Ligand binder design. Structure first.
Ligand SMILES: c1csc(-c2ncc[nH]2)c1
Ligand SMILES: [Zn+2]
Ligand SMILES: [Zn+2]
Ligand SMILES: [Zn+2]
Length: 572
C-alpha cells in the first residue's frame, strides 16, 4: 500500500477501490475521480468504510474521520472532518481522460483511441485495465466437456447451458483438462489439439485466463538522438546484399529507438538480419508477438547468421510446433529469437521488435520491462492487421491507434520506410500503393498478367456469425477447370467457415487473411465472401492481395474495392 499517483506521481496512501486495477490516486486526483465517476470506494491503510457495526456506508463523500476511525453522517462523532472537502480526499502527504479509462467496458473503439491519446502513465493504466477486463471476460464463457469421438480429427462437446458459448474458429485457444491447448473449427466439429491425446468422454477445456501483471516500463522509452553511433561497432566490409540499408543501420545506432514501415515484401526480415551483419559484435534479441513471426526471423538468420550463436527461446509449456534448428533455451547466445510472452530477464545491444502492427501497448511495455537495451528497432506496417481486440464490438480501430509505435508512424511518419516491393506483380503493388501507402510503394516486379478480379456477390450464408458464400467457391471451381496452373493456389478469405467449405469443395490449402499475414505464395485465390466492415477493411484487403508472388484471383462482393483492384476483369 505504499506508492505514487498515476496522474501526477504525488505520493499517497489512497488507491481507488472501485478501479479493476486499484491505482494510486493523490488527494486532489482521488477527489476529482470520486466526484466525477460512480467510483466511490477509496482504499489506503484501511478502506474508507463506516466502522460502526453493520453500517454499509462505503461512499467517501458520505464519510468522515472521528478520532482515528471512519464513520458516515449517521455514525460520526461531533469532532469529525468530512473525507471529501476542499478538492481533496483525506490522505497521507496532502483527469477527465483517467475517468473514462477507469470506467469504460472496452467494447467501443473510442475506448482504444483514448488508451493511445493519453499521457504515458495513462497508456499503462489503460493497457493494464484493458488486459484485466479481457481476462475477467474469459470466465464469463461456459465450460465444455467431451460427449464422443468420431475420428482422429472430428468430435462433439457438451456445453454448460446458460453461460454464453465462445466463438468457434482459430482465434480462441482453450486449455484442455491438463491435456494441452486446443482449438475448434465447425453437427461434426473439428478438434485441433496442440497435444495428441484421445480426448476421452469426460475431459473438459477452458479459455486460459493467464493473470495480468502490473505494468512498470513505458510503451516507448524516452527518445534520444545521438550525433554518432553509440555502443555498436559497424563494419566497412558489409556485403553489397545489405548495402541498401547501410544509411538506415547508421540511423539505428544514432537513436535510442527507431521505426521502420515495411509494406509487404519490401525486405523487413532482410533489414532485421542484415542489421546483425552491420554491427557484428552486437548482441541482438529478435522479438515479436507470435511464434510464426519469431520463426520467420529464425529462417532469415539461418541463411546469414552463424547457427552456433543462435538460440530459439521456447516457453516451458510447449503450445504448438516452432523452430527446431537453433540451440533451444540458451539465454546467453549472441542472437536470441523469442516471443514477447516468453522473454526472459536480460539485456542487449539492440532489440528488434518485428510485426509491430500486431503488438498491443501491454506488449510494448513488457518488452521495455524484460529487456534493457542500447537500441530498440520496431519493424512493421500500420497498413497491415492489428492484434484482434476481443472485447471491441462497436466502431473500427484505425491504424494510428494500434499501439504507440503505430501512432507515431501514422502522425509524424516512420523513421525509415522500405519503398520497393519485391514480392508482388505490379498489379498488386500498384493497387495497395494507392489504397494504403499514398502512392509511395514501388513495384520491383513487372505486371504478371495473372491478376484477375470478378465482381460476384453470390449468396451469403451464416455458420452462426462466420460467413459462407458457396456461389463464390463455385465460381473458383469453374475457374480452376479452365486454369489448371491455379491448382497450386492457396485459398484465402476473411472467414474460417468459407475456408472450410472451400477446403472440401476445391481441395486447395486454406488460410484466413489474418493467418496469411507474413506469408507468401505463388498463387492466391481470394473470395471476399460478404460486404461487411470485416471483409471490407483496407488493412485486411491489403494483406490478402499482397500474399501472391505470381498471380491472384479476387472474387469480390464490394464494388469499391473491386473497382480499386488494378487487375484484369474476368467473366461469368
Ligand atoms: C458495416 C459497417 S461499415 C460496413 C462497410 N464498410 C465498407 C463496406 N461495408 C459494413
Ligand atoms: Zn476508480
Ligand atoms: Zn495525483
Ligand atoms: Zn455509518
Amino acid at each position: 500500500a505504499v506508492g505514487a499517483c498515476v496522474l501526477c506521481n504525488s505520493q499517497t496512501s489512497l488507491r481507488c477501490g472501485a478501479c479493476i486495477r486499484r491505482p494510486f490516486l493523490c488527494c486532489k486526483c482521488c477527489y476529482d475521480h470520486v466526484i466525477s465517476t460512480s467510483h466511490k470506494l477509496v482504499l489506503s491503510v484501511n478502506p474508507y468504510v463506516c466502522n460502526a457495526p453493520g453500517c454499509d456506508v462505503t461512499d467517501v463523500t458520505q464519510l468522515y474521520l472521528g478520532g482515528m476511525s471512519y464513520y458516515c453522517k449517521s455514525h460520526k462523532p461531533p469532532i469529525s472532518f468530512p473525507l471529501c472537502a476542499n478538492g481533496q480526499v483525506f490522505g497521507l502527504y496532502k483527469v477527465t481522460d483517467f475517468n473514462a479509462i477507469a470506467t469504460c467496458d472496452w467494447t467501443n473503439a473510442g475506448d482504444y483511441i483514448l488508451a493511445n491519446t493519453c499521457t504515458e502513465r495513462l497508456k499503462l493504466f489503460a493497457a493494464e485495465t484493458l488486459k484485466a477486463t479481457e481476462e475477467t471476460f474469459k470466465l464469463s464463457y461456459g465450460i465444455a466437456t467431451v460427449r464422443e469421438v468420431l475420428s482422429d480429427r472430428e468430435l462433439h462437446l457438451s456445453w454448460e447451458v446458460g453461460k454464453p458459448r465462445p466463438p468457434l474458429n482459430r482465434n480462441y485457444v482453450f486449455t484442455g483438462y491438463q491435456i494441452g491447448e486446443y482449438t475448434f473449427e465447425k453437427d461434426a466439429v473439428v478438434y485441433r489439439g496442440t497435444t495428441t491425446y484421445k480426448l476421452n468422454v469426460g475431459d473438459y477445456f477452458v479459455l486460459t485466463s493467464h493473470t495480468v501483471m502490473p505494468l512498470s516500463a513505458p510503451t516507448l522509452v524516452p527518445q534520444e538522438h545521438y550525433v554518432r553511433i553509440t555502443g555498436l561497432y559497424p563494419t566497412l566490409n558489409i556485403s553489397d546484399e545489405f548495402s541498401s540499408n547501410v544509411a538506415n543501420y547508421q540511423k539505428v545506432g544514432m537513436q535510442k529507438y527507431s521505426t521502420l514501415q515495411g509494406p509487404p515484401g519490401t525486405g523487413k526480415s532482410h533489414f532485421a538480419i542484415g542489421l546483425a551483419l552491420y554491427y557484428p559484435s552486437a548482441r541482438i534479441v529478435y522479438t515479436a508477438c507470435s511464434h510464426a513471426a519469431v520463426d520467420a526471423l529464425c529462417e532469415k538468420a539461418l541463411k546469414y547468421l552463424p547457427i552456433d550463436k543462435c538460440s530459439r527461446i521456447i516457453p516451458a509449456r510447449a503450445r504448438v510446433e516452432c523452430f527446431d534448428k537453433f540451440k533451444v533455451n540458451s539465454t546467453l547466445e549472441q542472437y536470441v529469437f523469442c516471443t514477447v510472452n516468453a522473454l526472459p530477464e536480460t539485456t542487449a545491444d539492440i532489440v528488434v521488435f518485428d510485426e509491430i502492427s500486431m503488438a498491443t501497448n501491454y506488449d510494448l511495455s513488457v518488452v521495455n520491462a524484460r529487456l534493457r537495451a542500447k537500441h530498440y528497432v520496431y519493424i512493421g506496417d500500420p497498413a497491415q492487421l492489428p492484434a484482434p481486440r476481443t472485447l471491441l464490438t462497436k466502431g473500427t480501430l484505425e491504424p494510428e491507434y494500434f499501439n504507440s509505435v503505430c501512432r507515431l508512424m501514422k502522425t509524424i511518419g516512420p523513421d525509415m520506410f522500405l519503398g520497393t516491393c519485391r514480392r508482388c506483380p505490379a498489379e498488386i503493388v500498384d493497387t495497395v500503393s494507392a489504397l494504403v501507402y499514398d502512392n509511395k510503394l514501388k513495384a520491383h516486379k513487372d505486371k504478371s498478367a495473372q491478376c484477375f478480379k470478378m465482381f460476384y456477390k453470390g449468396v451469403i450464408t451464416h455458420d452462426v456469425s462466420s460467413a459462407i458464400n458457396r456461389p463464390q467457391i463455385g465460381v473458383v471451381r469453374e475457374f480452376l477447370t479452365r486454369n489448371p496452373a491455379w491448382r497450386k493456389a492457396v485459398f484465402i478469405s476473411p472467414y474460417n467457415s468459407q475456408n472450410a467449405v472451400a477446403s472440401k469443395i476445391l481441395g486447395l490449402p486454406t488460410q484466413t487473411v489474418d493467418s496469411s499475414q507474413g506469408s507468401e505464395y505463388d498463387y492466391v485465390i481470394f473470395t471476399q465472401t460478404t460486404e461487411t466492415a470485416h471483409s471490407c477493411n483496407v488493412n485486411r484487403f491489403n494483406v490478402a492481395i499482397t500474399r501472391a508472388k505470381v498471380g491472384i484471383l479476387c472474387i469480390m462482393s464490394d464494388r469499391d474495392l473491386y473497382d480499386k483492384l488494378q487487375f484484369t476483369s474476368l467473366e461469368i
